[PDB]
């Protein structure tokens, strides 16, 4: 095992979260969210690591040496970190839904695409070889889902038809109902074909105009107008925390990670963005 411990976790957004990768060449008015290689939102593991590390260094002020061993020193480093974060893969995003007719309707649903689940499969397969970990349960669920890659499906529900984000009609096929839930909320999960999924997900993002106002005269200050992109509340990302054997990794994994529940990612935290719940796949599944 190249890695002592391997814990995948989910990144349920409690509030809207805004991770940066700031203005592009063209849209100098926008502050966009961090994007994946194939266009979906993502959280770079550098942002994950920085935020979680800054959080741990205050929440556990007495285990600071364990944290500096596993997540790297920062005063004068004399060796590499023993811990790695993978980039957060978008796992499921909430979308407003208008269900035609079925059992008592929902007003929102979780939307995912086959490409996202394929990236989750890649993460899980790669770390099941670099570790003694084996997530055969999550992997079996994801492969049962990826078996039906052509058709837009829905999990443990029928719905047979829907309008997503009040712009996209989808026809849904109930998979088999034998596959139990994954992110076990009450809401269903739609696995969309990626062409329509890209549009649905892009609509489920949040673009917000913001301004700055003169204090004395309550008028917009010259230039104070811009746009920002938020990931909505309830959005679920997927990542893995990996560690090499240290006896500080055992402490980190059995003490720090078992008591790490809410952290604060990304920016604009003073306007309430960034609160996040971690879920540690090894127990939520």
């Amino acid at each position: 095992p190249y890695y002592a411990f391997a814990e995948p976790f989910f990144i349920h957004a409690i509030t809207h979260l805004h991770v940066g990768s700031g203005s592009s060449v063209e849209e100098e008015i926008a502050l966009p969210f961090q994007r994946d290689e194939l266009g979906y939102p993502t959280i770079y593991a550098s942002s994950l690591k920085g935020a979680i590390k800054s959080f741990l260094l205050k929440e556990f002020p007495d285990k600071r040496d364990v944290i500096y061993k596993v997540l790297g020193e920062d005063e004068n480093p004399e060796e590499a970190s023993l811990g790695t974060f993978l980039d957060a893969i978008l796992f499921a995003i909430p979308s407003r839904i208008i269900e035609i007719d079925s059992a008592k309707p929902y007003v929102w649903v979780y939307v995912t695409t086959y490409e996202l689940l394929k990236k989750v499969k890649l993460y899980l397969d790669s770390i099941s070889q670099l570790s003694n970990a084996s997530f055969s349960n999550l992997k079996n669920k994801i492969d049962t889902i990826l078996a039906k890659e052509g058709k837009n499906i829905t999990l443990d529900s029928d719905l047979k038809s829907a309008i997503l984000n009040e712009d996209f009609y989808v026809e849904l096929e109930a998979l088999n109902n034998k596959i139990p839930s994954i992110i076990n909320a009450g809401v269903p999960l739609l696995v969309l074909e990626d062409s329509i999924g890209r549009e649905v997900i892009n609509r489920s993002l949040i673009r917000v105009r913001r301004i700055r106002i003169d204090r004395d005269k309550k008028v917009v200050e010259t230039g104070g107008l811009w746009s920002e992109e938020y990931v909505p509340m309830k959005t679920i990302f997927f990542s893995v925390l990996l560690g090499k054997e240290s006896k500080e990794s055992a402490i980190f994994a059995s003490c720090i990670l078992r008591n790490l529940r809410y952290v604060i990612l990304g920016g604009k935290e003073t306007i309430g963005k960034g609160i996040v719940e971690l879920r540690w796949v090894k127990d939520v599944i």
Binding site: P77, E78, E79, A80
Partner: protein
Amino acid sequence: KRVLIKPLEPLMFRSQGEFTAAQSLIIPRPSTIAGMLGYILFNKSSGTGDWLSDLTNLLATIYGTFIETNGEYLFPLRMGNHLALVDQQHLINLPTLLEKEYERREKGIYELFYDKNKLFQIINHQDRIGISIDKSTRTVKEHYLYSARYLAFKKEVNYVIFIDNDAISDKINGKIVNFGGENRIAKLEVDDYKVDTSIEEEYYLALSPILIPDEALDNFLDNISDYVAMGKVDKISLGFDIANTKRKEMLTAILEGSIVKRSIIDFIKNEIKNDLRYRFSKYEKIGYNTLMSLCKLALRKILS
């Protein structure tokens, strides 16, 4: 007969010390080609402290190196601190251009080395920096930061040599060899090719470094115009011997791509006693004194 050395990847022919990055030569020296060929043909029983004796025994007369880009043939040409690759169609009028008039001289030669120069269309200089890491800290091991300017190829390039013996030209075909410096790779391929020999022209092109016997150094130097019309004369090391793990020698040489006058031949022929005559005959056997005619592709050794 003809051997094409096709580099699979950027190459490194380290020259002139290591002390931003260490620079690579354009055309590998004949010692490198001879050493690669001897590496193929080696047998671990003929060892002797004379690296070039055991090397001359392993092969036959090798004729100097030039460039085959895409059917075209490029040849080195230097004016003094100015290397270039030109197609022979621009070497034809060169001697005429040599003692041509002054402003015409510079017009022509600087049009040759700059616009007719096909070097940069062919060659890129690729700096590569490497480091070493200690297997317990996972941070850069101290003092291990090295750099080297490799020789990358924009289009497919071959180094062309001609070997006389045809017996080795069977167990040389299709060999993947460790051509050059820091563990780089090239493929050898052998093909029958027709090349004239030993034409009696006035101006030859040094396809390889013409060595100087260190006895006529003062003689050859104090009247230099009598032998080289254009090119560079420099003290070069002869490389590194695999058997004894040392540098080889240092000799003044006429760097490849120089324009030599016919007189040089007789000069070299008159300043070698039997001992160093045999020595430099070996040197020429492995490929140092190769001349080509500005007329056409026709080679000849100086001594042999």
